[PDB]
C-alpha cells in the first residue's frame, strides 16, 4: 500500500515547483526531494503573491518537523499544517 500522495513529486525542481503552484490557489503545495541539499526534502507552498519553500527537518529517532512540533511521518506533518499555519509571517494553511 505504498503509492505516493498525489502532491509528492520526488524529482520536481524548486523552479518547477514555483511555476506549478503559481497556477493554484493559496495553501496548495507539493513535496519534492530537495535540489540544493541532496538527501533533504522540501515543501513548496503557494502563498499570496508567490511560492515559498520549507525545509523538512529530521532527528535521529526519525521524526519530521519544520518549526517546533514533531511528527512520526511526513503525512502527519502535512495534516497538522492544515490547521496550524505553515508560515510564521502570514496566515497560510496546507490545502489539497
Amino acid at each position: 500500500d505504498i503509492e505516493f500522495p498525489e502532491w509528492f513529486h520526488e524529482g520536481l525542481s524548486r523552479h518547477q515547483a514555483e511555476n506549478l503552484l503559481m497556477g493554484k490557489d493559496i495553501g496548495f503545495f507539493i513535496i519534492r526531494a530537495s535540489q540544493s541539499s541532496p538527501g533533504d526534502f522540501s515543501i513548496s507552498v503557494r502563498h499570496e503573491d508567490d511560492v515559498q519553500h520549507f525545509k523538512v527537518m529530521r532527528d535521529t529517532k526519525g521524526n519530521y518537523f519544520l518549526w517546533t512540533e514533531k511528527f512520526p511521518s511526513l503525512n502527519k506533518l502535512v495534516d497538522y499544517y492544515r490547521t496550524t499555519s505553515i508560515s510564521k509571517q502570514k496566515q497560510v494553511f496546507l490545502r489539497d
Partner: peptide, 6 residues
C-alpha cells in the same frame, strides 16, 4: 536558495 524555517 533560502527556506523560510531556516
Amino acid at each position: 536558495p533560502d527556506y523560510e524555517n531556516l
